[PDB]
Amino acid sequence: AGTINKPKKPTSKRKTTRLRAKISKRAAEKKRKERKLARKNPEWRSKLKKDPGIPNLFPYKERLLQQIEEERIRRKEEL
Amino acid sequence: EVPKAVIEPNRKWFTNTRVISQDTLQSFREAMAEKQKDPYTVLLKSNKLPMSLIRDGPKLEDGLKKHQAKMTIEREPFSETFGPKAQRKRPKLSFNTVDELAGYSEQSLDSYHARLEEKKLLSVATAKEAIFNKGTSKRIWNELYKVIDSSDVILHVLDARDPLGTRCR
Amino acid sequence: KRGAPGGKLKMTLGLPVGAIMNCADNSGARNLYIIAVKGAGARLNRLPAGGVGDMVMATVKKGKPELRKKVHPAVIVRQAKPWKRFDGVFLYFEDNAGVIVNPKGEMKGSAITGPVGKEAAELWPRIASNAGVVM
Amino acid sequence: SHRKYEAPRHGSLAFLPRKRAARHRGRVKSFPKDDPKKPVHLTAAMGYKAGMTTIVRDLDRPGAKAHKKEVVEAVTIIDCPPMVVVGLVGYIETPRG
Amino acid sequence: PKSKRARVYHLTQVNKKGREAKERLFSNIRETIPKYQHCFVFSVDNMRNNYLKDVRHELNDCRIFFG
Amino acid sequence: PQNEYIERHRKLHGRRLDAEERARKKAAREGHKNSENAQNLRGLRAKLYAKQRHAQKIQMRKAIKQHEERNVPSDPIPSYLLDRANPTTAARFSVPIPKVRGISEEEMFKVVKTGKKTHKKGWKRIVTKPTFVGPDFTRRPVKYERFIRPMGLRYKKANVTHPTLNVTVQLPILSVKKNPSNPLYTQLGVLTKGTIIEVNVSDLGIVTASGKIAWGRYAQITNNPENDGCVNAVLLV
Amino acid sequence: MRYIHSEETIPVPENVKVSIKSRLVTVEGPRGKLQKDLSHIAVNFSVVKKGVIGLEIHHGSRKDVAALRTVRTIINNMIIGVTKGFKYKMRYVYAHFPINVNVEKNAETGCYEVEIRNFIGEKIVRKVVMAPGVEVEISKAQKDELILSGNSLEAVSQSAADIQQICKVRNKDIRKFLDGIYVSEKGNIV
Amino acid sequence: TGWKDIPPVPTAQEFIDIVLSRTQRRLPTQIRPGFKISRIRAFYTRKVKFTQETCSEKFGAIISSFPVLSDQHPFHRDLMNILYDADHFKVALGQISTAKNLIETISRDYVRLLKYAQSLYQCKQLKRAALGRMATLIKRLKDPLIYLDQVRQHLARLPDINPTTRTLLVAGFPNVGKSSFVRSVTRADTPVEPYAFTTKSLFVGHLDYKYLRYQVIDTPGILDHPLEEMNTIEMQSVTALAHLRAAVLYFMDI
RNA sequence: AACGCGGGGUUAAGGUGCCGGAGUGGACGCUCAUCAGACACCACAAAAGGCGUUAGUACAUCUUGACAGCAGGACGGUGGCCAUGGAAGUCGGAAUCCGCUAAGGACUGUGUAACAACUCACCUGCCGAAUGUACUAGCCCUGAAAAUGGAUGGCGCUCAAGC
RNA sequence: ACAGGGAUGGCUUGUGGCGGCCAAGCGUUCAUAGCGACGUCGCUUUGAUCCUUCGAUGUCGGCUCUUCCUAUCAUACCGAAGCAGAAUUCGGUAAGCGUUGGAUUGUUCACCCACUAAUAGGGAACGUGAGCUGGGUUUAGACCGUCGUGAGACAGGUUAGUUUUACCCUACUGAUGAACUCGUCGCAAUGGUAAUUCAGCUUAGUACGAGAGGAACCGCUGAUUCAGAUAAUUGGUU
Ligand SMILES: [Mg+2]
C-alpha cells in the first residue's frame, strides 16, 4: 500500500468516558451472565481432573517411579 | 405490556382436524368431472376441500415435458457430455439411415428458409414517448389492486365502439 | 470509429442542440433538428454545439414520412454564424444546412443543393465528390 | 450529502492571493541553470510594450494542415532601445539561500 | 521456529521401510548362510547396476544380496 | 486461427525460453507469498482470505487422514428402493416450542394517522407481522377498517417438516389456531413464532386407522416470518 | 536463546590476497580487485590458519549466527570472481522481426552499452548501460548469443537482468509471442 | 462471423463472489440505527435491488450471447448438436434463464416486505434473507456454468464456414491425403500425419480462382458402418456432407 | 481521603525522560508493529489466519547412519480387465495381485494421436549428528474502515520512556 | 383564547430460515449423555411466458458553490484467463485528474434516450433545526366525496392565500498602515501549487490470422475539459 507516502486518518488511541463506562458495564454483565450459565451448566464434569504426570525430560523420573513403587509396597505391607 | 406467550399441552394438537372418506372423495371427483360453467350463477362461499385429491391430474405430454430436462441430466451429467473428462462418443440423432438424413436435411433447409422469409416479412429509431406509458404506472396499479381487494362486485366498463379493444383480460 | 473527424482546426460553433437547419440533399427531408453533436465533451449546463464539418445526430421535422421516425447522422455543410479560417478570413453563409450521411460518412442522397464549406468538403470526401460548389 | 453533479472548480489555487503585485516592474523569479562549459551570456532583457499588429506567415510545419500555406497571426511589438550596464552583484551560497 | 520449510506428504502407496526391513535382511542372510558352500564378495563401483537383475536370472541356483 | 491453435503453436515453436524456470521460482516463492498475504491483508479481503485458508486446511487434513486409513444404507429397504435417494429418517402432549418471546401491542400495531389538519386522528392500526386472511377474503371499507393487514404481508403457504418422515413439503395454510401472545392476534391471524396453524397435509399421504384420508393437521411455526420472508413450521406429531 | 560462540571458515587460494579492515573486504587475484563493505553485519574477522579466514559472532541470536553464512558466501563469490570470473550467456530469439543487438564501449564513462533494435518491429531503440567491470561480446560460435563476463557476480547478473527486463512484451499473449532475450547459461570464465 | 464475442462464464462461486463484491463496493455500507426508518428501508432496498440487477445483467449477457439453435442454418445447428449435445445445451441455458427469473421474483418479494419493515434489525434480516436465497439459487447452477464455459471456449475457436458460397468439401477414409490436398491448395494449417484421425475437426482454407473466393473444407475421415455406429468425429464430416451444398471431392487411395 | 485559621514532619491513591515535584534507578527476560504499546477487561472474533519470534509438552527417527542434498536404480508377468477411432501406470469405470527384490504404485506428476522420454513414491552409494510432526503458553502481524486537520494529555521513546 | 411546559451510537458492511444427517475437535470415560466449525440433504423454462404491477403514519427536491472519503466508472501501471490479432473478462496498486446534455408529475417522479474516456458511490443536513425556491404541508375564504340528527370531523379530492436583518463581533476576500532615516537592488522560511482526455498522420493494411479482420513503442499534428493572459483582427456594446 501507499501508506508511507500518503498515510490516512489516524486511528485514535484516546478513550472516551462514555465508551469506557459502557465497556466496564458490559464486562460486568458478561461476568454475571457467565456465572449464571455456569450455575445452570448441564455439561458433564469429572470429579478428578486428568493429572499430567511427570515430564520426560526430568532426569530423575525413573528414581521417582522407584520411590512410588516402594511407597506402594510399604503401604500394602502396613495395611 | 409484554404478555406471557405460552402454549399449553393439549391432546388436540396431535390429532387430525379434517378427515375425508374414499366414497366422499369419489363423489367429489365425479362432481368435478361433471361441473359446467354458468354466467348467471355466482360463488358465495367456497367449500374447504382437499382439491389436490379431487381435481384431475396434469396432461400426459405436460407430465413428460416437465421432467424431460431433469431426466436427461440424470441419464447424462454435464461433466460427461462436454469438457476435459467427457465420455460422450455417439451423438443423438433424429435420423437413422442416409436416405432419412438426406430427406431431413431437405426439410430442415425448407423450414429455415420459411422462417427467414417470415422474419423478413415481419439509422436507429427514436425512442417511444413516455405519454404512451400512461395507465401502466405502479401508483395506478396499486390503486387498482386496492379497489379490487376492497370490492365484492367488480363492474368492468367497456366502450361500445371497441369492446374487445377495451376489455382487460 | 465514432463520427467525429480528425484533423479539424478550431472554429466557432454556431449550431447548438435544438437548432433546426436545412437539409441540403435530395434524400427527401427538408430540415434537420439537431439532438446531439458527435465529439461533444462534458460540461455542466453547456449545450453541445456543432460547426461546419461536424457530424451531428438529427431527426427530421419536415420531409418524407419514412424519415420522420429515425435518428440520422448528418454533417453540417453551411452555417450562418461567422467564423475564422487559418488564412484570417472571417466568413459566413446565408443559412445553416447539413446533409444526411451514414456513420462511415457516405451520403444518403445523391446530390447537394447549394455550396458546401471547405472544412466539410475536406473532412468528408463523399461530400467533396457530390459538391457542385465548394466555398 | 454529496454533490449530485460533478463540475470542476472555477479558477486555480496556484495563483493566490488574487492581490495587487508588490512592484510594477516584473521580477525574474528564476534564472536559467548555469553551465560553466557554455560561453558567457546575459539571461534577460527589458523593453516597453508598444502594441499589437497582424502578419502573414509562410508556414513550414510538417504534419499540420496549414503546411506550405499562408497563415494570419497576431503579434506583439516590444520597443527595445539598448540597455546600459552599470553594475555587478556577486552572490554567495549559504544554508539560508 | 515459525519460519520453516513445509514438508510435503506423499499421497502414494509405498511407505518408508524402517527397522523391519533391516530385521528381514538379517534373517534372510542368516538363513541363507548354511545352505551354500561358498560366499563371494563382489564390487560394482560407479556403475548403473541394473544388469544385476540379469545376473540374478542367469545364476538362478545362487543367491545375491545387494543391501 | 481454428481449433487448438495455441496448442499447435506450442507443439511447433515451444514456449518462451525462461517459462519453466519462472514457473518453478514462482511456485517456490508461494510459501513466502502466502505468509505475507496472511500477515498483510486488511479488512474484508483479509477475512475472506482467512476463511478460505481455514477451509483448505480442513480439507487437506481430511485427505491426509483418508490416506492414513487407506490400509484398513441403514434402514432395510427392498430391491426396488435400493440405490435411490431415501431420507435419513433420524402422556405429555407438549408442543416443541412451549414458550416464545411475547409481543406487545405497541410492537404488534403501528398507528396510522388520518386527517388534513396538523393534529391527526390515530385510530387505525396496521399489523406489522405476517398474517393469514383465509379464503373468500374481502377487505373492509376504509371508513370502518380499524385493523389493516397489508396485502404484501399476507401468506398462504408454509414449509412444513414432518419430524418422523424427515421430509419438508410446502403446504397450504388452512387456518390459524392459536397465537400464543394474544387472542386478538389469533383472530387477526398473525403468523409469528410459536403459533399453532392448521395445514393441508394431502401431499404427505396420511391415512387414519379407519382408512380415512387425513387432510388437515396442526403445525407450529418455528421461525420468525417477519424477519425471514417465509413461514417454517413443524408438524405436531 | 543466545549462542556463546559461532564460527565460519573461508579457504583462500594461493594466488589470492585478501585484506580486511573495519569490515571492508578487498580481494585481489589474477583477474583484478573486488571490494565490498560488510559493516552492516556485526562479525569478528580473523586468520585462524594459514590460508583460512575465520568469522566469529559472540553472544548472538539465531539470526545473527545465520548472517555469517551469507557473509561467507559473499566473500567466497568475490574470491571466485577474482580467480575464475563469472560469465552469463544470453540468447535472443525472434519469430518474424530479427532483433539487432549492437555493442559499444563508451570512452567517456568506460562502460559498455547494448542497443536493441527491431524488437517485434518496434521503431524505438532500447539502450542498456552495463555496470562497470562487465564486458559484453557477441558470440561467434553460436547464433544470436551475447556473452557478459566480469569479476563481480552481482554486476554480471544484474546486467543480464537489465537486458532481460528491457525487452518485455506488453499487451500480448505470451503463449503466442515468444520474443525476447533470455539468460541461457551461467558459469565461470575459466 | 463466429462466436468469439461471448463473455466468459464464471463458476457458481465466482459468480457469487463477483455479485456480492459489486454490492459491497459500489454502494455505501454504513447505516445507523438512529436514522429514520424510511432512510434505513431505502438503504436495504437499494442493496437488494442492486444485487438483483447485477445478477440479471450477467445472466442476460450469458443468454443473449450464446447462439440460438433454432435461428441457425441447419449445418450450424446440426454441427452444434454433434459437438455439444443440443439437449444439454438448451437445458443449461434454460436453467440460466429460470434462475434469472427466480432471482427477480425474490427481489420483488423482499422489496415489498422491506416496505413494511419496522427496524434496522428486521431490515437487515430481510436483506440477508434475500441475498442468501439469491446465493443458493446461483449455487444450484454449478454443472451448467462449467459446461457453458467449455462450450464457449470451443465455440470461440470454431472455424467460420459460410454455408452459401463457393465451397469444395474433401471427404474419404483416413490417411488418403485430404489434409495434404488442403495444405497444397490453401493456406490452412491442418496437420498431415501418417496415423488415422490426425484431423479431428473441420478445418477450412481459402483460395482464389478467376478472381472469386472459394472455401475448402477438410473433414475427419469416415469409416464403413451405419450412422448409429459413428462417433462425433465422423459425424462432423457426415453433417458437412449432408447440409453443405458443395463440390464433394471423395478421395480414395488405390 | 472527608474540611476552623496557621507552622513543621510523614504518608494514601497515584507517580519519578521532559512538560512536572520525584530515578534516563537496580535485576532477569520478552517484543520491532507500512500510524506497536503504554487504564485493560466488552464487541469485532472463530475449534480464525501467519514460511514472525522465543519457552514448553507429547509422540516418533537416529553411527544397525536420522532430517537435507548429490550420484545412481526405479525392474519382470504386463500393452493386467472392460471400454475407446486411438488409450501401453498417467481421458475413463472397476479391481489392485505376484515375482525379482536392496527397492520400485497394476503408479505421483510432465509428456505422446498412441508409444517413447522425463519425473515422484521407495532403495543403494557419498556425507556426517542430531532431527521431524502436532499441540500448549507468551509477545508481534491480520482478524473491516469511511469521510474538515489531531491526538497513549502532548513532545517523543526501540538492551524503552513498551510488556 | 389564556397560564405554563417541550421539541440507537467503537452502531454498520458479502454470502436466508427451519428440519435432519455427518463431523475434526470440546467433554465423558462408577452415567456415554451433551456442545460442535467444515460441510451436506430437503422445502422454498429444452434459453419459457408476456392474459397475476398486491396499500404514503414515516417525504423528498432543485439551484449555486467548496471540500473530503474510497467502498474505482474512466484515465496510468500491473497479475491471471483460448488472452492469435482486435475487443475484453476477473483481480491488484492507485482519489493525481474527470464523471455530461435531455424527455417524462393521469406521481413514491423514477425509469428511458443520446453524447462521451466515463457518464462510480458516498459524507460534511436528513442522529430536530433562519441562503433562494418547488412538494410532505396542514390559520382564516370556498366546493365535491365519506361519516354524523347537528355543531362539525375526515378514506379523501380540488382552488386561493404576509416575516420584511446586517451598519455589530468573528470568519472570509481584498485595501492601507505606526515603530526601525529615506530609497534602490535582492534572498527565500513558510503557505498555495495545475493540467486533463480524446482523435488523426506515420509505424501499416504491418505483426497476427484459414478467413473476416487487425495493433503497439519511437516520431508528428490537431482537438475536449480546465487554467492564466490579451484585444492585431472579427462580432457585441454607444
Ligand atoms: Mg492422417
Curated annotation (Swiss-Prot), chain E:
It comes from Chaetomium thermophilum (strain DSM 1495 / CBS 144.50 / IMI 039719) (Thermochaetoides thermophila). Component of the ribosome assembly machinery. Nuclear paralog of the ribosomal protein P0, it binds pre-60S subunits at an early stage of assembly in the nucleolus, and is replaced by P0 in cytoplasmic pre-60S subunits and mature 80S ribosomes. Associates with the pre-60S ribosomal particle. It is found in: Nucleus, Nucleolus; Cytoplasm. This is Large ribosomal subunit protein uL10. Belongs to the universal ribosomal protein uL10 family. The chain holds residues 2 to 68 of 270 of the full protein.
Curated annotation (Swiss-Prot), chain H:
GTP binds at residues 172-179, 197-201, 218-221. Mg(2+) binds at residues 179, 199. Signal peptide: none annotated. It is found in: Nucleus, Nucleolus. Involved in the biogenesis of the 60S ribosomal subunit. Belongs to the TRAFAC class OBG-HflX-like GTPase superfamily. OBG GTPase family. NOG subfamily. This is Nucleolar GTP-binding protein 1. The chain holds residues 2 to 255 of 661 of the full protein.
